[PDB]
Design a protein around this ligand. Structure first.
Ligand SMILES: NC(=O)c1ccc[n+]([C@@H]2O[C@H](COP(=O)([O-])OP(=O)(O)OC[C@H]3O[C@@H](n4cnc5c(N)ncnc54)[C@H](O)[C@@H]3O)[C@@H](O)[C@H]2O)c1
Ligand SMILES: NC(=O)c1ccc[n+]([C@@H]2O[C@H](COP(=O)([O-])OP(=O)(O)OC[C@H]3O[C@@H](n4cnc5c(N)ncnc54)[C@H](O)[C@@H]3O)[C@@H](O)[C@H]2O)c1
Ligand SMILES: O=c1ccn([C@@H]2O[C@H](COP(=O)(O)OP(=O)(O)O[C@H]3OC[C@@H](O)[C@H](O)[C@H]3O)[C@@H](O)[C@H]2O)c(=O)[nH]1
Ligand SMILES: O=c1ccn([C@@H]2O[C@H](COP(=O)(O)OP(=O)(O)O)[C@@H](O)[C@H]2O)c(=O)[nH]1
Lengths: 309, 309
């Protein structure tokens, strides 16, 4: 049993991951940007080196899961000061800590680093494909790619031991609605309130249920390979177009699509994210159990409970 | 037509030379930098601070903006990374938000550091068609310049902003003060003029460019501005030399031997060779440097003797 730090530990993936790691008997400190009522929790703004160093003055960590971030492509454009300071300077503070202390780190990147690539998003597309294939389309995507490069330069210069993960389209319990969240919680919250929402038809995604993904994220402790990078998401065969996902939300809520406005495609948005999960299947026992239809049913149920509907 | 031009980083090395070249052509030029000075047509503005950026534009309308404001140098970037990311990236995003509102034309200062450790001809299209692993940026400073380029291209795509990117290479000459964080030329010159020891890492090659030549090329962008373009600006492909050759030119111009020099094989985490292609600057920007390294180094030795009395 390891001592583990989860930054962004009060977020959506963070909350789920902290619970998964604790269920495995790890000792886990959750750190995030606000005070909470949680146990084994500490506020630390990762932009502030003093507050990052204070996390490490208490105890030694074997593993650090670094999720602390400004999340979302349009959040990143609208709040870019917070984005760059948190996602990049915060990551560099974590790397300076890792170079001093020698913990193992799991860096949270994003499938947004593949840009608008139309082919199979294998991890080696960010190695052997022409650079123009994956040009990042928004500041958020660039912060995650800069993070990856900084992790590799730290490894080269100081022998730091880091695994990078590229999460994909995660949904499920502990993801609150806001207008800056992804499509699934937008669709569910709006459908639950009979409020109109837009479907941009011309795109496809693979959605991953958070309970599955954090199982895989937690498996990195059991087979940690310094220098590696993994796409972590659902299954290649779970790819759907956006109307298919909307129709699953509406069916689980029990209404038709009269509240839906159909548009052809969202500008400046990736068309398709056709992921390859073969490396996670190989090294991390990746084996997701909850496909979109069942996952959306569970997420509708959780939001009804959470919002006291 | 005489233009109204803003130069950020206008009290720095290239900035001071560029402001002078532009004013000599009869442009109206406001210089902006991080400190108060005695200079005329000068304003302090910290480009990290949006309010201070906005204030630059509340007085005057600018036709062209040369954006040089930056934390310069790979080792400076590692040692002062907070300042690096906030100035080089957040500052550039503030300038792009201003460009989106006001519609001025911008020249963005990147770096040949964006080519990483590439061993082939560093043509601009290496950052387009070559495998991404060929040019992985090796330090935070290099990443900030590549991030800036991507942000410029995303602004052009989303808002129709008109930007030319330049990749300066290894610039030297008058108005470059010595510090320990400067590049190899002023380090060699200053130390030699003071009989102070310095190291030569032999296993590298560079092409060095005299600043009065480079700013003539930078000023020429006003006369032929092609939205979306990117140019390497430096000396000539055939001015390539190994580091000992440059040391020997400095020592000869000072009038001493190399007893102050310690020879090492190669500098870790440092690009081996920067074999630049200037064919695009020759085509579009009348690039025609008059001052090769031998003569350039003589003139720079002369200027440092005057400055440091
Ligand atoms: N589908 C996905 O959700 C997805 C996809 C790709 C990448 N990611 C990445 O996975 C991670 C988790 O995403 P999420 O969906 O849980 O988002 P989230 O916003 O719910 O989680 C991020 C957490 O980081 C915290 N945080 C922000 N700035 C901070 C700071 N300065 N100091 C400390 N904490 C700070 C936030 O308060 C939040 O709780 C992020 O790194 C995100 O970029 C997620
Ligand atoms: N000199 C070279 O060989 C070379 C090579 C590649 C790229 N570049 C780029 O060219 C530009 C000029 O380089 P230089 O050699 O003249 O360096 P320099 O440091 O002399 O010039 C940069 C200037 O930016 C100013 N500055 C820094 N932070 C600022 C802030 N927040 N607000 C306002 N001003 C700020 C500095 O005070 C300085 O005067 C930089 O963008 C640099 O990265 C130079
Ligand atoms: O209201 C909406 C929102 C989104 N969509 C569509 O749903 C798809 C998914 O969009 P999301 O923004 O949820 O997800 P994206 O994959 O585009 O990026 C999102 O998830 C991955 C993260 O790394 C990014 O930061 C985040 O913005 C897109 O095709 C979008 O057009 C709608 O049809 N309607
Ligand atoms: O004291 C020094 C500093 C640098 N260099 C070498 O000079 C070259 C130019 O390095 P600089 O940092 O000036 O520029 P860059 O590497 O960023 O092009 C590199 O090969 C360095 O190894 C050197 O021999 N001695």
């Amino acid at each position: 049993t390891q001592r583990i730090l989860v930054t962004g530990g009060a977020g959506f993936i963070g909350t789920n991951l902290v619970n998964e790691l604790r269920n495995r008997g790890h000792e886990v400190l959750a750190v995030d940007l606000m005070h909470t009522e949680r146990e084994d929790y500490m506020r630390a703004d990762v932009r502030e080196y003093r507050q990052v160093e204070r996390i490490f003055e208490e105890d030694k960590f074997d593993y650090v899961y670094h999720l602390a971030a400004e999340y979302g492509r349009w959040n990143g454009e609208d709040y870019y000061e917070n984005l760059w300071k948190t996602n990049v300077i915060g990551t560099k503070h974590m790397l300076r800590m890792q170079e001093k202390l020698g913990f193992r780190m799991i860096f949270f990147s994003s499938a947004e680093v593949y840009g608008d690539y139309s082919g199979l998003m294998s991890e080696d597309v960010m190695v052997k494909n022409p650079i123009s294939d994956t040009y990042q389309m928004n500041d958020y995507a660039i912060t995650k790619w800069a993070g990856e490069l900084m992790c590799m330069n730290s490894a080269e210069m100081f022998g730091t031991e880091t695994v990078r993960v590229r999460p994909v389209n995660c949904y499920g319990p502990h993801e609150k609605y806001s207008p800056y969240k992804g499509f699934i919680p937008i669709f569910i919250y709006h459908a639950l309130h009979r409020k109109p929402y837009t479907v941009y038809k011309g795109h496809k995604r693979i959605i991953d249920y958070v309970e599955d993904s954090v199982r895989t994220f937690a498996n990195i402790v059991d087979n940690f390979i310094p220098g590696e990078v993994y796409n972590v998401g659902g299954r290649t065969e779970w790819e759907h177009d956006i109307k298919e996902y909307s129709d699953m939300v509406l069916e689980a809520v029990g209404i038709d699509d009269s509240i839906v406005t159909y548009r052809e495609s969202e500008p400046f948005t990736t068309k398709v994210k056709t992921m390859d999960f073969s490396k996670a299947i190989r090294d991390l026992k990746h084996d997701p159990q909850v496909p979109p239809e069942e996952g959306i049913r569970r997420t509708v149920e959780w939001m009804k409970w959470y919002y006291r509907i």
